[PDB]
Design an enzyme around this catalytic site. Structure first.
Site, short mmCIF file in Angstrom:
data_model
loop_
_atom_site.label_atom_id
_atom_site.label_comp_id
_atom_site.label_asym_id
_atom_site.label_seq_id
_atom_site.Cartn_x
_atom_site.Cartn_y
_atom_site.Cartn_z
N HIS A 61 0.93 -1.65 -0.01
CA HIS A 61 -0.09 0.11 -0.09
C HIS A 61 0.78 1.27 -0.24
N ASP A 91 11.54 21.43 -24.70
CA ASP A 91 11.49 20.59 -24.22
C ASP A 91 12.35 20.40 -23.45
N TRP A 126 6.90 0.05 4.78
CA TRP A 126 7.51 0.41 4.09
C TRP A 126 8.74 1.43 4.06
N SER A 156 15.51 5.86 -11.73
CA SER A 156 14.45 7.11 -12.10
C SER A 156 14.58 8.15 -11.92
N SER A 157 14.31 8.11 -10.07
CA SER A 157 14.18 10.37 -9.54
C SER A 157 15.25 10.39 -9.72
N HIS A 240 12.48 11.48 5.92
CA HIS A 240 12.09 13.27 6.16
C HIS A 240 12.16 13.80 4.38
N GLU A 242 11.74 12.79 1.65
CA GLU A 242 10.76 12.06 0.89
C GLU A 242 9.93 12.75 0.71
N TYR A 244 8.94 15.57 1.90
CA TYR A 244 8.92 16.50 1.61
C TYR A 244 8.89 17.31 -0.26
N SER A 255 -0.80 26.24 -5.30
CA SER A 255 -0.63 28.26 -5.43
C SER A 255 -0.89 28.41 -7.20
N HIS A 290 12.73 12.39 14.02
CA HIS A 290 12.13 12.34 14.64
C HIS A 290 11.29 11.37 14.24
N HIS A 291 11.62 10.29 13.86
CA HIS A 291 11.36 9.28 13.54
C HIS A 291 11.72 8.25 14.79
N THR A 316 5.94 26.90 6.84
CA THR A 316 4.64 26.57 5.76
C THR A 316 3.76 27.52 6.14
N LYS A 319 3.35 30.28 3.91
CA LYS A 319 2.80 29.84 2.60
C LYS A 319 1.28 29.77 2.68
N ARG A 438 0.26 1.43 15.42
CA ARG A 438 0.31 0.53 13.77
C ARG A 438 0.25 -0.54 13.67
C1 HEA Z 1 3.35 14.47 2.93
C2 HEA Z 1 3.20 14.11 3.07
C3 HEA Z 1 4.60 14.46 4.89
C4 HEA Z 1 4.05 16.40 5.51
C5 HEA Z 1 3.70 17.39 4.11
C6 HEA Z 1 4.48 15.85 6.58
C7 HEA Z 1 4.52 17.44 7.56
C8 HEA Z 1 4.78 17.45 8.91
N1 HEA Z 1 5.62 15.81 9.49
FE1 HEA Z 1 5.09 13.70 8.82
N2 HEA Z 1 4.83 11.87 8.27
C9 HEA Z 1 4.65 11.34 7.24
C10 HEA Z 1 4.21 12.45 6.51
C11 HEA Z 1 4.52 14.02 5.50
N3 HEA Z 1 4.96 14.51 7.05
C12 HEA Z 1 4.68 9.98 7.06
C13 HEA Z 1 4.22 9.49 6.03
C14 HEA Z 1 4.76 9.92 8.31
C15 HEA Z 1 4.97 8.53 8.99
C16 HEA Z 1 6.40 7.76 8.40
C17 HEA Z 1 6.24 6.60 9.13
O1 HEA Z 1 6.91 6.01 9.57
O2 HEA Z 1 5.81 5.68 7.91
C18 HEA Z 1 5.24 10.95 9.23
C19 HEA Z 1 5.44 10.93 10.25
C20 HEA Z 1 6.20 11.62 11.17
C21 HEA Z 1 6.65 12.16 12.77
C22 HEA Z 1 6.90 11.03 13.27
C23 HEA Z 1 5.77 10.37 14.20
C24 HEA Z 1 6.50 9.39 14.86
O3 HEA Z 1 6.40 8.25 13.80
O4 HEA Z 1 5.70 8.97 16.20
C25 HEA Z 1 6.80 13.12 13.00
C26 HEA Z 1 7.28 13.98 13.94
O5 HEA Z 1 7.94 14.96 14.13
C27 HEA Z 1 5.80 14.08 11.99
C28 HEA Z 1 5.92 15.60 11.77
C29 HEA Z 1 6.16 16.60 10.82
C30 HEA Z 1 6.11 17.82 10.86
C31 HEA Z 1 6.52 18.71 12.02
C32 HEA Z 1 5.51 18.27 9.87
C33 HEA Z 1 5.30 19.69 9.05
O6 HEA Z 1 6.26 19.55 7.95
C34 HEA Z 1 3.89 20.30 9.06
C35 HEA Z 1 4.27 21.59 9.19
C36 HEA Z 1 2.83 22.18 8.56
C37 HEA Z 1 2.09 23.00 9.87
C38 HEA Z 1 2.29 23.28 10.55
C39 HEA Z 1 1.26 24.14 8.77
C40 HEA Z 1 0.57 24.84 8.50
C41 HEA Z 1 0.93 25.94 9.40
C42 HEA Z 1 0.33 27.19 9.98
C43 HEA Z 1 -0.72 27.29 9.56
C44 HEA Z 1 1.45 28.01 10.50
C45 HEA Z 1 1.30 28.30 12.59
C46 HEA Z 1 1.41 27.16 12.62
C47 HEA Z 1 2.38 26.80 14.04
C48 HEA Z 1 2.47 28.03 14.94
C49 HEA Z 1 2.48 25.59 14.83
N4 HEA Z 1 5.88 13.20 10.46
C1 HEA Z 2 0.38 8.84 -0.41
C2 HEA Z 2 0.99 8.14 0.10
C3 HEA Z 2 -0.98 6.69 1.08
C4 HEA Z 2 -2.18 7.47 0.69
C5 HEA Z 2 -2.61 8.07 -0.55
C6 HEA Z 2 -3.28 6.52 1.20
C7 HEA Z 2 -4.30 6.88 0.92
C8 HEA Z 2 -4.80 5.78 2.00
N1 HEA Z 2 -4.15 5.29 3.11
FE1 HEA Z 2 -2.78 4.60 3.55
N2 HEA Z 2 -0.60 4.62 4.13
C9 HEA Z 2 0.88 5.24 3.23
C10 HEA Z 2 0.02 6.33 2.64
C11 HEA Z 2 -1.25 6.22 1.81
N3 HEA Z 2 -1.95 5.97 1.68
C12 HEA Z 2 1.51 4.64 3.80
C13 HEA Z 2 3.57 5.13 3.98
C14 HEA Z 2 1.17 3.77 5.68
C15 HEA Z 2 2.72 2.97 6.56
C16 HEA Z 2 2.52 1.92 5.82
C17 HEA Z 2 3.56 1.03 6.95
O1 HEA Z 2 3.33 1.13 8.42
O2 HEA Z 2 4.82 0.72 6.38
C18 HEA Z 2 0.02 4.26 5.52
C19 HEA Z 2 -0.78 2.77 5.90
C20 HEA Z 2 -2.12 3.14 6.13
C21 HEA Z 2 -2.23 2.53 7.77
C22 HEA Z 2 -2.65 1.88 8.88
C23 HEA Z 2 -2.13 0.15 8.24
C24 HEA Z 2 -1.38 0.28 9.52
O3 HEA Z 2 -1.00 0.70 10.66
O4 HEA Z 2 -2.20 -1.82 10.56
C25 HEA Z 2 -4.20 2.58 7.17
C26 HEA Z 2 -4.74 2.07 8.01
O5 HEA Z 2 -6.85 2.65 7.31
C27 HEA Z 2 -4.21 3.22 6.03
C28 HEA Z 2 -5.76 3.76 4.97
C29 HEA Z 2 -6.12 4.14 3.75
C30 HEA Z 2 -6.58 4.21 3.40
C31 HEA Z 2 -8.58 3.87 3.38
C32 HEA Z 2 -6.43 5.70 1.66
C33 HEA Z 2 -7.27 6.55 1.16
O6 HEA Z 2 -7.20 7.42 1.35
C34 HEA Z 2 -6.95 5.88 -0.55
C35 HEA Z 2 -8.68 6.10 -1.08
C36 HEA Z 2 -7.86 6.00 -2.64
C37 HEA Z 2 -7.50 7.75 -3.04
C38 HEA Z 2 -6.44 8.64 -2.62
C39 HEA Z 2 -7.02 7.15 -5.07
C40 HEA Z 2 -5.98 7.53 -4.56
C41 HEA Z 2 -5.82 7.04 -6.28
C42 HEA Z 2 -5.01 8.80 -7.12
C43 HEA Z 2 -5.16 9.67 -6.67
C44 HEA Z 2 -5.31 8.33 -8.35
C45 HEA Z 2 -5.70 9.10 -9.68
C46 HEA Z 2 -5.31 10.06 -11.20
C47 HEA Z 2 -5.20 10.38 -11.39
C48 HEA Z 2 -5.26 12.32 -11.14
C49 HEA Z 2 -3.56 11.12 -13.15
N4 HEA Z 2 -2.60 3.86 5.26
O1 LIG Z 3 7.80 12.83 7.37
O2 LIG Z 3 7.04 13.83 8.32
CU LIG Z 4 10.31 13.23 8.89
#
Ligand code: HEA
Ligand code: HEA
Ligand SMILES: [O-][O-]
Ligand SMILES: [Cu+2]
Ligand SMILES: CCCCC/C=C/C/C=C/C/C=C\C/C=C\CCCC(=O)O[C@H](COC(=O)CCCCCCCCCCCCCCCCC)COP(=O)(O)OCCN
Ligand SMILES: CCCCCC/C=C\CCCCCCCCCC(=O)O[C@H](COC(=O)CCCCCCCCCCCCCCC)COP(=O)(O)OC[C@@H](O)CO
Ligand SMILES: CCCCCCCCCCO[C@@H]1O[C@H](CO)[C@@H](O[C@H]2O[C@H](CO)[C@@H](O)[C@H](O)[C@H]2O)[C@H](O)[C@H]1O
Ligand code: CUA
Ligand SMILES: [Mg+2]
Ligand code: NA
Ligand code: NA
Ligand SMILES: [Zn+2]
Lengths: 514, 259, 84, 46, 73, 144, 227, 43, 79, 94, 49, 58, 105
Positions: A61, A91, A126, A156-157, A240, A242, A244, A255, A290-291, A316, A319, A438
């Site tokens: 997934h 291009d 993953w 690829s990337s 991390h 990744e 971003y 935007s 932080h992970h 952030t 933005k 989890r």
């Molecule tokens: C697109 C994906 C994405 C993005 C953008 C982010 C953004 C951020 N993430 Fe996240 N994160 C994940 C995807 C993402 N994360 C995933 C997949 C995991 C789990 C990985 C795994 O274990 O599988 C994870 C896990 C993860 C953890 C680990 C928790 C744990 O495993 O125990 C933490 C802890 O620091 C963290 C923090 C943050 C923070 C601080 C941001 C910041 O960048 C967010 C900043 C944005 C805002 C704060 C909102 C906008 C701001 C304002 C409106 C201004 C005013 C706000 C304040 C004064 C606070 N994330």
């Molecule tokens: C981009 C990343 C992404 C997205 C979109 C999602 C989408 C969803 N995820 Fe997932 N998820 C992860 C990334 C993502 N997930 C990751 C990284 C983990 C942790 C893995 C790990 O623990 O190792 C996780 C784990 C995770 C768990 C926890 C499993 C566990 O801890 O046991 C669950 C359970 O509910 C869950 C559910 C879902 C559901 C219901 C959706 C639904 O919202 C999905 C619904 C459908 C869509 C959002 C459409 C997608 C398709 C398109 C957008 C194509 C269209 C094409 C064009 C426009 C060209 N996800």
């Molecule tokens: O990685 O948040």
């Molecule tokens: Cu992180």
């Protein structure tokens, strides 16, 4: 002619289209896997089997959604289509290498499919942490196939990143400075820099896992003086940046969409937006641990990672508020794309804020490896990255295809998805706070209510996905050809018509220096 | 007819064959590691070599023979090569990180010391020092080659480039011999792991870099390079300096400090 | 540092050739002589079956699965000791 | 050289909406079905 | 009839913004005051009150007599 | 009137409240009477009839502000259809419950829950706020 | 343990968990404030026919957008780090207990005085006694003295696990070759539950933790009886 | 955006067909697998 | 000398969550001490403190494995 | 020391590379490597925009350091004005 | 000329709403889904030991 | 050796519509066919290998 | 910055240019409506007289529509502007959108 065009392409638009098709297919795979997760969890007990089959599904997934859906759609698809047009380039810098970045993905996906078909699959998460991912606890080919899948996706990337950086720096009109390029172009350039630096570290780490598994190295094996925790550092040093990488092209599209449907010629605070993306890209490299707040790191290290992580809220926020200031005084067009973008701004903010909660190492002790993390990341991914993708898709579909969608259908689609994703993920905060771990195929009885509701939410999301396919069909079936598009003076990608000719900007734009 | 200076590339099969070669090499390694067979891997390596040969052949055709490398195209290739080298630096960084992690905090299994109990490191003043003098020397000779080419001197370019290649080969043979002579192996815990994987990837890069230099040598023989236009040689020289610098870091870290 | 050499009038081919033959290759010749004097076989280390060494978690994909890729019978013992 | 314009800049035909429906059904449907059949496959092993 | 008076014609958007941003702020103070009172202070008081006269041995004896323990009957 | 795909590079007509005077007239080709009307427009506009004034407007512009800004009943269709598909989703869930899900564990049986609830109270699960705090240990009943 | 329809954290059983509850309350207030402010401003931006589409100057307003969030972050970080350093303080334990993670169960070692060790496995659903909790009960509980500072040491003899007890605020990864330390202090007697918190294979879901907190004298007699 | 009327209009009936076929293509195969889970789990 | 031993006291050399080296150091210290006491024909009982500490801190399997390797002659620490 | 044998660009450059080289010697830019310098941009003194067809896209950076570029097709015939700043551009085909 | 929404909007809204509520109520209450609500104010505790 | 770059320039600039990878002549076609055959055949073989490895061999 | 009076005066002068062309009329109005203001009657008066010099009756009507639009929910602004313009509307024979039925949806 077919093979020459579609297998031997050196054209940024056609390669863009290949990536969009690939990403769409992957989305279906990722959606099926998500539904299998929620079916298993939709009532107490065991549906499929024990945690092995369950976590093979969870693992796949994540890989499919991240590597095969989001990155190929945002970077390969929208990046290839839009970036050369937005800078009036004929291009990409390396149009042939561009095609290999694409063709590496079906083999990468095939290797992932193979991993799940052979032996008992890779039920590792993953993150692929050893020793569970090692040759004793995961004997056989599955994890090696996963490693190789990641290698191909990585190459690829990396080559794609070289291509985008070179194109964006080198192929602008001579009068256009980097501070005269659209925000989407910036977002791709910064994303590409993140890819270039982060993926090679992942490649090093997974290669070390590969040799631990097959060449009797012991990088991560304490018996040889290795350390499982070293793998975690190497992975997250990539992991991390990744996330971003997953969101930045999304920020760029948001935007453009917010600007466009506010009837504005420009986003509010352009240089602030550039600054914010660069700051987020930079800060994204110094926060990985932080992970790892529960692995047993020293307290001062935990204090540093808490603080450096939180600081990312500042750029952030700049933005988020700048998007709001872009809406301000707009002639608002309530297009389906606008709806996606508005949903993005709010729901991404929510997920970003729960990220800030998690940045606190003290509280993260209790929240780590629980559904609170799952709630955080699906807000920024399913309601962030995906909302930006859907917004961009609806907005630019007429450019790519020359045909219009039915706006009413697209609004219905948005409404269904919005309800579904919120119903799926909101209750997971409760599950996380109350302690549901989890990667569980089953849960203590107390957690039944929120799991039931979450699973019902996932089915609503399924209906939205199925409807999306029909909506795309309807557009191609009806063939409403585009006539006029507003605001071309500030949206160059539209100026060559819909679809633009195979070759655009054969004669480059005239831009003088004054 | 275009009125920009950029290169629209003829539709090409090499991206697909390269991608498929990657599938075959990876599925091939899997077959070798698990199903006791080298067949897929051999086919993959073969198609990879065919792909690289024909792709780079075509780049030569496009530039030397067809004139598509305008200054703007050449500038793009400069950026491309620099960025590639950066990605390679980060790849090695991961291995240096692994090395320092293990060596700075040696676990009880090692005897809580570095080098581990039972490990007898090579003397850094022996062949490793020789290897260092060899690659440093090759950095000097390649710079001579560059200046000869810029000054239009065919014979001295060829002689200097030949010397550079000979040194690359000498390093490779010396490393091969050191690998054989080493009393420790890749299976000798994390010391063997870091030593052989880090120096091994470096050795592979020396082989790649030497091959690139050899390509340049034959292109020079065939008069491809002008005194002003010779990016293939520049790229090979940059890659070569990268290989030298990686060695210097390996020598200081693993051979010297880690002994 | 300014190395200890000189010139800097013009970094051209002649100078870099001068460095190649006057410094670089003589250094290589010297290190080669040095290595050729410290050459010859170092004594074979007495065998101790340390558990952090001679790691075998999976057989190698060549030979009998028990020999490293550049196995040297003289200095590389197997997990059970030096070969007979 | 190549066909230009709406419905021509794609690797699939849109000349007939029903043939298109069949192709889209096979395309998206195969993607959605695959994980279910992989699960079936894994369950049928042991 | 009579003439219509001249209305304000400039800065209508900015005036609307100024007025409502205050309402966005004045709300937040009102909510905070409430949220601190309804959740946070309630929690502090709940814990303070629970432990004020809490008898851990009495709690244990009740649990023991209910038969919950492996170590104590 | 008729707009062509191949005209993409030419100035075009748009109705946008924020762009009141578009780059071209809505109608450029003029009939005999429309030519006469444009000539009449060069003289005093007081001499133009209401119909002639409206005709001049309609040559220059497609829709008026009132027309281009009009509200629609689209929301009804969007909300209704979304609810329909959300409703359809429940059918899938009914199917899943009937054909996919087997019995849930015996620990959800009424008597089990009653006993488990007492045991949770006996071990004073969440006695500060969450669970046992809501039980009256003196009156042997749930707090009101 | 968690109870049905639970929204927040399990009730605190230790002073550190109490601190975490109040810090979460503080942070969540801030989260609610920012989320609602953004939602409100969004709605405000979208609910007027009035327009202003010419270039808007950005530098005045960006000061507020950077400085106010910076201040809010400091107000989160201050109590956040206070707690972090509190958790790290020297406390002088009366007892050391080790736990080793295994696939799929926990073993416990109490070796301050005697060689006391045992395995702790989930009670299978078919073998639960009436009133017992599915997936949560174990055969052999971790009996511990209440109101005493206990050093818990955590490792694994196979893959990663993680030893968690939410109501005490505890989660310490179990890593082979590594001995991780945490402190445990329960204000109350009772039964306190946790679950393996690192993915560890086929029965990851099914290797729970049950602490049994009792007076010292009871712990001593139990210890002796377990030899 | 403005656009031409549909070159090949898709009537409500045609849309109902496209929608139904699309939904069935997702539901039927998954449904088949899920319906038969017990059959697979007994092997 | 200082009995009523409860458990291993805080050790400022090892103040962090990772306590691996603490176990290791005390195991080394005990066996080094008992060897130095046997070599000089003295009393091993002066080493008891190190034994108590490592017994408290060290997993049973670690101690068992280390004891086995000392007997085998494969213990990699210096004693 | 120091003979010849290496071809020069003058001798050996070919195709587009050679065209660019030779044009540059003449002070000409047929392949748009350089940014054109603006005139006063009045109707009497319009920016002259070369083209090999009857239309070309102009990007207008209206004021120095504007991040926003204003894009429009410039067609053969009477001078056209940037829709943002009004500066005049006139196409000069072939 | 009335468009689709003018002609059918009311009916789509009414029918969609009615169908959605009816089917969700049925699914939630009639097919044996265990919601596992809180025992608080609902369950009479029973002797277990 | 002699400078024959001019000859190759003439060859690769011939107005014959051939793509660069085939413009050298018949030998290009052969090497291309060999490469594609090995790639496509090898890929088919990899899928066979997947099919084989997807099932147990007790 | 410049006063309200100076802003208004610049715009009056812009539209008052005797030989203002069609492009400049459109540029003027399209730019003006981007601002956070409903234009003063004196600005509108000048733009309407430019329409007259350009023999463009329709654009005069459209300008009246824009005034109404820029006022948004402030219903009192447009009737006041029309009141102020009545002598000019009478002089030039400009019918309002309402008199033409163009306020109908
Ligand atoms: C697109 C994906 C994405 C993005 C953008 C982010 C953004 C951020 N993430 Fe996240 N994160 C994940 C995807 C993402 N994360 C995933 C997949 C995991 C789990 C990985 C795994 O274990 O599988 C994870 C896990 C993860 C953890 C680990 C928790 C744990 O495993 O125990 C933490 C802890 O620091 C963290 C923090 C943050 C923070 C601080 C941001 C910041 O960048 C967010 C900043 C944005 C805002 C704060 C909102 C906008 C701001 C304002 C409106 C201004 C005013 C706000 C304040 C004064 C606070 N994330
Ligand atoms: C981009 C990343 C992404 C997205 C979109 C999602 C989408 C969803 N995820 Fe997932 N998820 C992860 C990334 C993502 N997930 C990751 C990284 C983990 C942790 C893995 C790990 O623990 O190792 C996780 C784990 C995770 C768990 C926890 C499993 C566990 O801890 O046991 C669950 C359970 O509910 C869950 C559910 C879902 C559901 C219901 C959706 C639904 O919202 C999905 C619904 C459908 C869509 C959002 C459409 C997608 C398709 C398109 C957008 C194509 C269209 C094409 C064009 C426009 C060209 N996800
Ligand atoms: O990685 O948040
Ligand atoms: Cu992180
Ligand atoms: C002068 C040095 C040149 C090196 C040439 C040697 C051949 C191997 C290929 C080179 C690639 C290098 C890295 C692969 C890692 C292992 C090889 C390390 C170098 C080496 O050759 O190490 C040897 C062991 O090789 C072994 O296991 C055998 C290993 C052979 C199988 C290779 C495994 C393939 C791994 C795939 C790598 C993935 C690449 C990912 C790219 C990143 C994508 C972004 C050492 O011999 P030994 O007997 O143990 O000790 C000496 C005792 N007298
Ligand atoms: C053991 C074997 C397995 C490993 C596989 C790798 C094998 C080794 C291959 C060695 C690399 C050979 C590269 C040859 C490239 C020749 C083409 C070339 O050099 O093309 C030049 C352009 O540069 C360009 O594309 C620049 C081309 C840059 C190529 C970069 C080479 C590095 C690739 C390394 C592969 C990555 C492996 C890393 C492992 C982790 C052509 O322009 P000029 O030179 O200016 O000429 C024009 C003048 O004549 C005009 O007057
Ligand atoms: C996670 C996403 C999944 C969402 C749920 C999908 C919704 C259901 C779609 C319909 O699926 C069909 O259901 C039938 C049952 O209604 C099955 O027939 C089965 O049952 C019939 C009798 O009950 C027999 O006639 C058939 O032989 C037997 O296959 C049939 O195979 C299956 O394709
Ligand atoms: Cu043990 Cu998860
Ligand atoms: Mg964890
Ligand atoms: Na389940
Ligand atoms: Na050079
Ligand atoms: Zn301009």
């Amino acid at each position: 002619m077919f093979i020459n065009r579609w297998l031997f392409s050196t054209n940024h638009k056609d390669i863009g289209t290949l990536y969009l098709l690939f990403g769409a297919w992957a989305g279906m795979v990722g959606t099926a896997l998500s539904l299998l997760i929620r079916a298993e969890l939709g009532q107490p007990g065991t549906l499929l089997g024990d945690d092995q089959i369950y976590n093979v599904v969870v693992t796949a997934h994540a890989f499919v959604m991240i590597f095969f859906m989001v990155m190929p759609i945002m970077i390969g698809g929208f990046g290839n289509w839009l970036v050369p047009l937005m800078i009036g380039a004929p291009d990409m810098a390396f149009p042939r290498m561009n095609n290999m970045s694409f063709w590496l993905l079906p083999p990468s996906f095939l290797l992932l499919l193979a991993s799940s078909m052979v032996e008992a699959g890779a039920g590792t998460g993953w993150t692929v942490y050893p020793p569970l991912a090692g040759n004793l606890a995961h004997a056989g080919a599955s994890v090696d196939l996963t490693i190789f899948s990641l290698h191909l996706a990585g190459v690829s990337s990396i080559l794609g990143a070289i291509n985008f950086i070179t194109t964006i720096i080198n192929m602008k009109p001579p009068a256009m400075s980097q501070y005269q390029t659209p925000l989407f172009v910036w977002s791709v350039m910064i994303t590409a820099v993140l890819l270039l630096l982060s993926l090679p570290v992942l490649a090093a780490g997974i290669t070390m896992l590969l040799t631990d598994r097959n060449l009797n190295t012991t990088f991560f094996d304490p018996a040889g003086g290795g350390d499982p925790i070293l793998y975690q550092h190497l992975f997250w040093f990539f992991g991390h940046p990744e996330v971003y990488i997953l969101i930045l092209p999304g920020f760029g599209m948001i935007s453009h969409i917010v600007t466009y449907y506010s009837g504005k010629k420009e986003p509010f605070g352009y240089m602030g937006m550039v600054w914010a993306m660069m700051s987020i890209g930079f800060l994204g490299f110094i926060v990985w641990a932080h992970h790892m707040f529960t692995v047993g790191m020293d307290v001062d290290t935990r204090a540093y990672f808490t603080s450096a992580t939180m600081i990312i809220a500042i750029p952030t926020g700049v933005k988020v508020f700048s998007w709001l200031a872009t809406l301000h005084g707009g002639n608002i067009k309530w297009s389906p794309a606008m709806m996606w973008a508005l949903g993005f701004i709010f729901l991404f903010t929510v997920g970003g804020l729960t990220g800030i909660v998690l940045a606190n190492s003290s509280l993260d002790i209790v929240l780590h490896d629980t559904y609170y993390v799952v709630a955080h990341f699906h807000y920024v991914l399913s309601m962030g990255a995906v909302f930006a993708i859907m917004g961009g898709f609806v907005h630019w579909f007429p450019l790519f295809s020359g045909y219009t969608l039915n706006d009413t259908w697209a609004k219905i689609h948005f409404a269904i998805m919005f309800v579904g994703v919120n119903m799926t993920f909101f209750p997971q905060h409760f599950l996380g706070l109350s302690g549901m771990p989890r990667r569980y195929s089953d849960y203590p009885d107390a957690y039944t209510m929120w799991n039931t509701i979450s699973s019902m939410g996932s089915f609503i999301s399924l209906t939205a996905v199925m409807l999306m396919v029909f909506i795309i069909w309807e557009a191609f079936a009806s063939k409403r050809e585009v006539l006029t598009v507003d605001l071309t003076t500030t949206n160059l990608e539209w100026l060559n018509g819909c679809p633009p000719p195979y070759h655009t900007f054969e004669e480059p734009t005239y831009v003088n220096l004054k | 007819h275009q009125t920009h200076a950029y290169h629209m590339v003829n539709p090409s099969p090499w991206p697909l064959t390269g991608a498929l070669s990657a599938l075959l090499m990876t599925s091939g390694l899997t077959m070798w590691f698990h199903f006791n067979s080298m067949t897929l891997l051999m086919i993959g390596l073969t198609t990879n070599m065919l792909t690289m040969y024909q792709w780079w052949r075509d780049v030569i055709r496009e530039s030397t023979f067809q004139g598509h490398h305008t200054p703007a195209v050449q500038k793009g290739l400069r950026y491309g090569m620099i960025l590639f080298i950066i990605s390679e630096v980060l790849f090695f960084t991961g291995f240096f990180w692994a090395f320092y992690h293990s060596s700075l905090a040696p676990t009880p299994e090692l005897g809580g010391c570095w080098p581990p109990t039972g490990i007898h490191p090579l003397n850094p003043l022996e062949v490793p020092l020789l290897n260092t003098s060899v690659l440093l020397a090759s950095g000097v000779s390649i710079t001579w080659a560059h200046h000869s080419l810029m000054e239009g001197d065919r014979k001295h370019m060829l002689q200097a480039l030949f010397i550079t290649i000979t040194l690359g080969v000498y390093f490779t043979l010396l490393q091969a011999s050191e690998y054989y002579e080493a009393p420790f192996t890749i299976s000798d815990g994390v010391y063997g792991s870091t030593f052989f994987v880090a120096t091994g990837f470096h050795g592979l890069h020396v082989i790649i870099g030497s091959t690139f230099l050899i390509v340049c040598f034959f292109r020079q023989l065939k008069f491809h390079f002008t005194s002003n236009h010779h990016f293939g040689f520049e790229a090979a020289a940059w890659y070569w300096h990268f290989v030298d610098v990686v060695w210097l870091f390996l020598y200081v870290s693993i051979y010297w400090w880690g002994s | 540092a300014s190395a200890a050499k000189g010139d800097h009038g013009g970094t051209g081919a002649r100078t870099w050739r001068f460095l190649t033959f006057g410094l670089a290759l003589p250094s290589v010749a010297l290190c080669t002589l040095n290595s050729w004097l410290h050459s010859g076989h170092r004594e074979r280390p007495a065998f101790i079956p340390y558990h952090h060494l001679r790691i075998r978690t999976k057989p190698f994909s060549w030979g009998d699965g028990n020999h490293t890729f550049f196995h040297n019978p003289r200095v590389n013992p197997l997990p059970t000791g030096y070969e007979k | 050289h190549y066909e230009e314009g709406p419905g021509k800049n794609i690797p699939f035909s849109v000349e007939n909406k029903w043939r298109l429906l069949a192709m889209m059904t096979l395309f998206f449907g195969s993607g959605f079905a695959a994980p279910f059949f992989i699960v079936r496959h894994q369950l049928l092993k042991k | 009839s009579t003439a219509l008076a001249k209305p304000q014609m400039r800065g209508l958007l900015a005036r609307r913004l100024r007025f409502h941003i205050v309402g966005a702020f004045m709300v937040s103070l009102g909510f905070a005051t409430f949220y601190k009172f309804a959740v946070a202070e309630k929690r502090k008081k709940a814990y303070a009150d629970f432990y004020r006269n809490y008898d851990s041995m009495k709690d244990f004896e009740e649990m023991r007599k209910a038969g919950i323990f492996q170590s104590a009957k | 009137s008729v707009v062509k795909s191949e005209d993409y590079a030419l100035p075009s007509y748009v109705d946008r409240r924020d762009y009141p005077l578009p780059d071209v007239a809505h109608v450029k080709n003029l009939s005999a009477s429309q030519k006469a009307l444009k000539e009449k427009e060069k003289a005093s506009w007081s001499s133009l009839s209401i119909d002639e004034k409206v005709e001049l407007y309609r040559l220059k512009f497609k829709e008026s502000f009132a027309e281009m800004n009009r509200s629609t009943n689209e929301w009804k269709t969007v909300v209704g259809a979304a609810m329909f598909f959300i409703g359809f989703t429940a059918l899938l869930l009914i199917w899943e419950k009937h054909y996919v899900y087997g019995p849930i564990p015996h620990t959800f049986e009424e008597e089990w829950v009653a006993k488990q609830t007492k045991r949770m109270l006996d071990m004073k699960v969440a006695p500060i706020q969450g669970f046992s705090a809501k039980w009256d240990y003196d009156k042997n009943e749930w707090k009101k | 343990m968690a109870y049905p329809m639970q929204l927040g954290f399990q009730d605190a059983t230790s002073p550190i968990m109490e601190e975490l509850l109040h810090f979460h309350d503080h942070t969540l207030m801030i989260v609610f404030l920012i989320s609602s402010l953004v939602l409100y401003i969004i709605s405000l931006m979208l609910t007027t026919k009035l327009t202003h589409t010419s270039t808007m100057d950005a530098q005045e307003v960006e000061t507020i957008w950077t400085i106010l969030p910076a201040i809010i972050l400091i107000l989160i970080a201050l109590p956040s780090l206070r707690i972090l350093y509190m958790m790290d303080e020297i406390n002088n334990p009366s007892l050391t207990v080790k736990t080793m993670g295994h696939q799929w169960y926990w073993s416990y070692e109490y070796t301050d005085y005697e060689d006391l060790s045992f395995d702790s496995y989930m009670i299978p659903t078919s073998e639960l006694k009436p009133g017992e909790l599915r997936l949560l009960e174990v055969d052999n509980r971790v009996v511990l003295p209440m109101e005493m500072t206990i050093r818990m040491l955590v490792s694994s003899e196979d893959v990663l696990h993680s030893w968690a007890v939410p109501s005490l605020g505890l989660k310490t990864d179990a890593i082979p070759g590594r001995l991780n330390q945490t402190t445990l202090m329960s204000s109350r007697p009772g039964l306190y539950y946790g679950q393996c918190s690192e993915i560890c294979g086929s029965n990851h879901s099914f290797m729970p933790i049950v602490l049994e907190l009792v007076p010292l004298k009871y712990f001593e007699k139990w210890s002796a009886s377990m030899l | 955006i403005t656009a031409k009327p549909a070159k090949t209009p898709t009537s409500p009936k045609e849309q109902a067909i496209g929608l139904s076929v699309t939904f069935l293509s997702f539901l039927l195969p998954a449904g088949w697998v899920l319906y038969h889970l017990d059959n697979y789990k007994k092997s | 000398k200082i009995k009523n031993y409860q458990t291993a006291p805080f050790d400022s050399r090892f103040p962090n969550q990772n306590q691996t080296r603490n176990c290791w150091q005390n195991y080394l210290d005990f066996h080094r001490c008992e060897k130095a006491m046997t070599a000089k024909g003295g009393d091993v009982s002066v080493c008891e403190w190190y034994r108590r500490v490592y017994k408290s801190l060290c997993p049973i399997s670690w101690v068992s494995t280390w004891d086995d390797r000392r007997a085998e002659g494969t213990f990699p620490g210096k004693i | 020391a120091s003979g010849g044998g290496v071809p020069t660009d003058e001798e050996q450059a070919t195709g587009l590379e050679r065209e660019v080289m030779l044009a540059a010697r003449k002070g000409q830019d047929p392949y748009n490597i350089l940014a054109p310098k603006a005139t006063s941009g009045t109707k009497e003194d319009p920016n002259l925009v070369p083209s090999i067809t009857n239309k070309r896209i102009v990007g207008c950076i209206c004021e120095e350091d504007n991040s926003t570029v204003i894009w429009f097709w410039l067609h053969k015939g009477e001078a056209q004005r940037c829709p943002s700043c009004g500066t005049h551009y006139k196409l000069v085909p072939h | 000329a009335p468009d689709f929404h003018d002609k059918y909007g009311n009916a789509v809204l009414a029918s969609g709403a009615t169908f959605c509520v009816a089917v969700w109520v049925y699914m939630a209450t009639q097919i044996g889904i265990e919601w596992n609500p809180s025992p608080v104010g609902r369950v009479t505790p029973k002797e277990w030991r | 050796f002699e400078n024959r770059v001019a000859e190759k320039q003439k060859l690769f600039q011939e107005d014959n519509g051939l793509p660069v990878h085939l413009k050298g002549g018949a030998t290009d076609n052969i090497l291309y066919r060999v490469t594609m055959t090995l790639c496509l055949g090898g890929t088919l073989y990899s899928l066979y290998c997947l099919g084989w490895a997807s099932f147990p061999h007790k | 910055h410049e006063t309200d009076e100076e802003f208004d005066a610049r715009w009056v002068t812009y539209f008052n240019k005797p030989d203002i062309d069609a492009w400049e009329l459109r540029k003027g109005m399209n730019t003006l409506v981007g601002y956070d203001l409903v234009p003063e009657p004196k600005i509108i008066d000048a733009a309407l007289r430019a329409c007259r010099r350009l023999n463009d009756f329709a654009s005069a009507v459209r300008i009246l529509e824009v005034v109404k639009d820029k006022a948004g929910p402030h219903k009192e602004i447009y009737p006041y502007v029309i009141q102020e313009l009545r002598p000019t509307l009478n002089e030039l024979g400009i019918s309002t959108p309402e008199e033409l039925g163009l306020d109908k949806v």
